A paper describes a structure:
In this manuscript, we have tried to assess the effect of using CDS for cryo-ET STA data collection in combination with the SR mode using a test specimen, apoferritin. Here, we show that a combination of both SR and CDS during data collection has allowed reconstructions of apoferritin to be obtained at a 2.8 Å resolution but this is further improved to better than a 2 Å resolution when processed with SR in SPA, significantly surpassing the Nyquist frequency of the physical pixel size of 1.356 Å (up to 140% of Nyquist), similar to that previously reported by ref.
Residue numbers in the entry:
A (entry chain M), B (entry chain F), C (entry chain U), D (entry chain J), E (entry chain A), F (entry chain T): 4 to 176
The structure:
Amino acid sequence: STSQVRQNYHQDSEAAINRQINLELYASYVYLSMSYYFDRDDVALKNFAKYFLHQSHEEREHAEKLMKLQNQRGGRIFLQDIQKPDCDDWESGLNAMECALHLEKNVNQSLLELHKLATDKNDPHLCDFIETHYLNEQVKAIKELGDHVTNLRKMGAPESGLAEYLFDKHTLG
Amino acid sequence: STSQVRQNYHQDSEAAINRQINLELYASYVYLSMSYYFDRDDVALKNFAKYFLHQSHEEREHAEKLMKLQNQRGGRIFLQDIQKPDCDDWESGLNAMECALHLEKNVNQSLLELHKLATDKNDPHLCDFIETHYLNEQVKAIKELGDHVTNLRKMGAPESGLAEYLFDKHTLG
Amino acid sequence: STSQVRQNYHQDSEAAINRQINLELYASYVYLSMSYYFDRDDVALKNFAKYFLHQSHEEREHAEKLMKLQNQRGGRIFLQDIQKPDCDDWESGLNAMECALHLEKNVNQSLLELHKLATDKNDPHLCDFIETHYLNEQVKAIKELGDHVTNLRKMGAPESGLAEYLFDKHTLG
Amino acid sequence: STSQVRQNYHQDSEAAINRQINLELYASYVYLSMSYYFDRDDVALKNFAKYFLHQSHEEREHAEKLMKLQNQRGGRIFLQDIQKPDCDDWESGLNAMECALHLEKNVNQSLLELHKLATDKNDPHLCDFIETHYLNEQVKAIKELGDHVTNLRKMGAPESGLAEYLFDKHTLG
Amino acid sequence: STSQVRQNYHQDSEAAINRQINLELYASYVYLSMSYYFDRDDVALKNFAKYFLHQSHEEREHAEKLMKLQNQRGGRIFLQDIQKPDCDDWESGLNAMECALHLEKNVNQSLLELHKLATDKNDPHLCDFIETHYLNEQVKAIKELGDHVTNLRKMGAPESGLAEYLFDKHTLG
Amino acid sequence: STSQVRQNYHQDSEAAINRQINLELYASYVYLSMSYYFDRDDVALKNFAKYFLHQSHEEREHAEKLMKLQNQRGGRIFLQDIQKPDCDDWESGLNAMECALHLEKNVNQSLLELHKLATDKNDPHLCDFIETHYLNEQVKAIKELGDHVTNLRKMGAPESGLAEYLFDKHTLG
Ligand code: NA
Ligand code: NA
Ligand code: NA
Ligand code: NA
Ligand code: NA
Ligand code: NA
């Protein structure tokens, strides 16, 4: 019943990897919802739409890399429903960037809890996998979203529709 | 409240497009689950894994094209949870191909019901969108999966593990 | 007497690196013996021979990288005899792949014990050297050998000589 | 007052990163002083001058990478005076290489103390940043300077001015 | 004790060159502090950060050219501590440009005092070195910073965060 | 039990080929030990290290060519332990070259005894294999090592560390 490849891979780590797969698929779905909000004819910011669609595809790659890790270590993937995002209408480019920053901090907190579990189960391959492929990516994503929120607030968003239009052209274009 | 672009787009068509978006995202998730089943070390058929991962990414493109249509016609996308697939373990390459054929026939039946609704609401742009981008794609997908099931059964799958290995190398490779 | 470069490098870590050098040279020698078994005229599977000769040369590179680490940290290499492999005749391609999987799991267990010693002696350079250059290589090697054993058993090896011939041509060729 | 990006970044780690920035800027300044000592007309070893000027520019890049890390994690850089180096006249190429080895061991000891603090504050992103970008660089720098000191002493430096001239041409040229 | 190359190089000129080396290293350090202020997530003007980091590296080249001059004329470099800059937080892009203009005028006044000393000691090689490599560079730097301050004030900085964002994109980008 | 390919291949020749395989693997291991001695920070002669590592890899190719010969003639390879080299510390570049000359003369004496056995068992294919692939290689290796020992002794090694440094740069570089 145990996989012939499994070695030093605790059942609690296997279950935490399955929960992280679901959270990465959920973040992919939130960014897909934000992307198509900015494609609506009454919002119409195409480079915001492009930026969040690229983030949706990168979160799906993060989930597929954890599914490959679960099979490489001999664990078994167990998928759950992907809940729908908490908003349908994201209000403004600034509000969506602030929601993305909040989501990325939540994903980063889950990865730090997974690292702590891997360290407590003395699984250095899993600790290094999370440090190499996920933790610096999340620090860079959080710093980029914080810079975007700071620039939109300083330019006068959300009240200034000129600010979001020019940020869409000069920063996200 | 009505979109400034909306013309000849009935609320029942808008709701049926939202249900089809969810079904395409669900099919993407079923094929992602099949792909990583064939990547397990106790199944180990890499070209089956590749074939179903490519199908998962194509179903996500089908869902994003319907989200773009909903915004082009001035409807509003409403997302729902993506339910987890009906199986975790798909048994054999033949059983997964038969499950994919069943899923693609279900998706095709939903598209034929959407076409019938668009014809009854006299929406020729939506009828042509479904004929141009979805109905022939589904007939081709169903005929390719039927050919794969026929070849695997004739070669002696699922009992012959030699049959699935050589089908993985010569048809899916 | 202490090297002028030595810093934060405990004598127990130096001795464990010398034991790991010997185990990597021993694994190189086991794979060289398997390679030339499959080159015999009464076994004659050339791509099995090639696959194990490539593994023998990669294990010698693993040993030379640990010898370079021992000199970079100011430890002193102490070599021991390389024992001959436990078998002369490896029986079949499936039996040799299962023996290789067993050997790679043993090498991985020794590397996990070396990581635990480096963590207990607070030597983060040595922990990171082992995570960066050895632990993911071993997880990938073990998953590839597990996939090869699974495919050979499903195709009907070792009893089916047709199975090993076609695996040699289509997977290892 | 807390940065919007800050997560899992303890104030003691932030202060230790500010001290390491100052030590890397101080090492850049020591190597700049050594470089221009070997450019004097009464010392005149141009490849020693080039080697230490390249080391000065690499230590400034090490300091700027830690300043970028401090902003990526939401800490605040606080700069201090850069003290002048302990020598004006470095005596001979061998004495300067021995002083560089001593300086690089001091920088490495400070990085090992920073790693230990990051491990005690459970900050795996900072532990991995220090292992990935600093600890192996320092082990390589210390082993290269130890090899240079060994070769200059064996060739008869500092008493043999022929030894330093030929080392400048054949090893540093 | 006198260098074999020294000719027509007065001890007061040698000491003034050592003070100018320290001032160029201090200006390099002020611009490095400004650069990383604009890289903070709550300021986030990347092209201001790039512009001041380039100025920091050019001031270090100005210091190294004066160290090369001191050795070419047979004087002896004597380094002093590099004091930390007068600010940690530079407030806004306009305030940092005004501080840079003030710093460059101070550096230019020191170079004009060095030229006057070289003229009073009848050292035409040193007068021409300062005119050729430093005085026109400083007039160009001061005119460029004055143009930047004028444009930022006319666009409405520092109160208009839109002004600094668009200046960062169109003038410094 | 006799191989279907075996013809004119006496059991005493088969056993002598197995002993020569072990001696070539032992010489590979002695040269690997010499290579990493010259990589130590207190010896630090990189081109001596490179020269002996290349010799280690060439002796492993000599052993693998005799394993291929044993299978081509239908004999059975029987491997034995590879004993560790007689020294851990090789003293100086001259002493290691003299030890290599002694080792290569021993390998050549074993090959001349194998040729004499093949001639006494009237096995001209094996005599020609040894003349074509091994005897002139050994005469060239012994003459090159004798030239290296002569040059190092004439330059004043081992007492002159300048001699070994310049031989490492001009002859082995
Ligand atoms: Na992610
Ligand atoms: Na579809
Ligand atoms: Na290995
Ligand atoms: Na450094
Ligand atoms: Na300057
Ligand atoms: Na040989």
